[PDB]
């Protein structure tokens, strides 16, 4: 992508304002629960003003940063795509569970991811990407060997390096993996997203193995969901104690959220603190808490520690 000037930033500002106006329509009924695009876009705008404020005068180094260019390009694409969603989705935008409506929700999730990534690589408006400290040491060593001190890398290169260390069986597996790790949906992989994924499916030594057993084949996996959606889904098993599902939170990237019904029965949530997910699932199953994945009678034996 081309070097970022203040002009293009102002253009993205205009597009974001347009999307905000399109979402401010009264007939849309905005659910305040995340992702809330009417809060996302302004926060992105304000953080962008912070980055520009700290890099005022020295705009030369800010416009040459590879991640900032990729981010601004992605923001351009996503905002423009949202405008197109409203444009070619006339009446259907004013419904429930509609195609452009669900697409708008998904794009909102993307905006949330991009805002989190932006605040992560630019904390307090100052760049902190070439100064990475990935939570998992093994994953950080892999990134250090493969891409060195680069903040972001193209998806193809990441797939190559990952396949060198962790073999990928099929292109389908690579696609599903891509849909899982590429949160900003820009065909790129940042150190931020890499940290999130490797924290999610720890340990590193059996990364793709955990991902196949926790995400791909485990019927309890629900990807990104809202607490209300978890409640509404587990509601069909409020009479079947032990039934559980786990999700990802757009407000808490890198951590799992296990929802389970009790013997009363109430629906409760548990967030493991730097535990491998399968460890918490095994422990919970042996204690009669996590018995039925998505209500299914058979729970996956994850005793492959």
């Amino acid at each position: 992508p081309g070097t970022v000037d203040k002009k293009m930033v102002e253009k993205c500002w205009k597009l974001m304002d347009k999307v905000v106006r399109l979402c401010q329509n009264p007939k849309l009924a905005l659910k305040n629960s995340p992702p809330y695009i009417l809060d996302l876009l302004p926060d992105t705008y304000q953080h962008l003003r912070t980055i520009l404020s700290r890099y005022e005068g020295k705009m030369e180094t800010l416009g040459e940063n590879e991640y900032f260019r990729v981010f601004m390009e992605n923001l351009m694409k996503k905002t423009k795509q949202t405008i197109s969603l409203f444009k070619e989705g006339k009446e259907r935008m004013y419904e429930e569970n509609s195609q452009p409506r669900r697409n708008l929700t998904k794009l909102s999730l993307i905006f949330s991811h991009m805002l989190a990534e932006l605040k992560g690589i630019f904390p307090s408006g100052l760049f902190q990407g070439d100064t990475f400290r990935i939570t998992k040491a093994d994953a950080a060593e892999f990134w250090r060997k493969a891409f060195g001190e680069k903040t972001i890398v193209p998806w193809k290169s990441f797939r190559q390096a990952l396949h060198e260390v962790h073999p990928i069986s099929s292109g389908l597996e690579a696609m599903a993996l891509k849909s899982t790790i590429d949160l900003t949906c820009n065909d790129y992989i940042s150190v931020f997203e890499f940290d999130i994924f490797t924290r999610l499916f720890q340990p590193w030594s059996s990364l793709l193995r955990n991902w196949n057993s926790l995400a791909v084949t485990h019927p309890g996996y629900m990807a990104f969901l809202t607490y209300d959606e978890v409640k509404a889904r587990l509601q069909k098993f409020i009479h079947k104690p032990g039934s559980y599902i786990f999700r990802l939170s757009c407000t808490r990237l890198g951590q799992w959220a296990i929802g389970y019904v009790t013997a009363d029965g109430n629906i409760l949530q548990t967030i493991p603190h730097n535990k491998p997910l399968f460890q918490a699932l095994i422990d919970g199953f042996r204690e009669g808490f996590y018995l039925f994945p998505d209500g299914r009678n058979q729970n996956p034996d994850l005793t492959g520690l």
């Binding site: 899982t180 949906c185 791909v216 019927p219």
Partner: peptide, 19 residues
């Protein structure tokens, strides 16, 4: 077997630049 990877894969196919 699949479950919620279906949702993310469907979203990906429907919204990304693809393949």
């Amino acid at each position: 077997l699949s479950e919620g990877l279906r949702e993310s894969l469907s979203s990906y196919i429907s919204l990304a630049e693809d393949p």
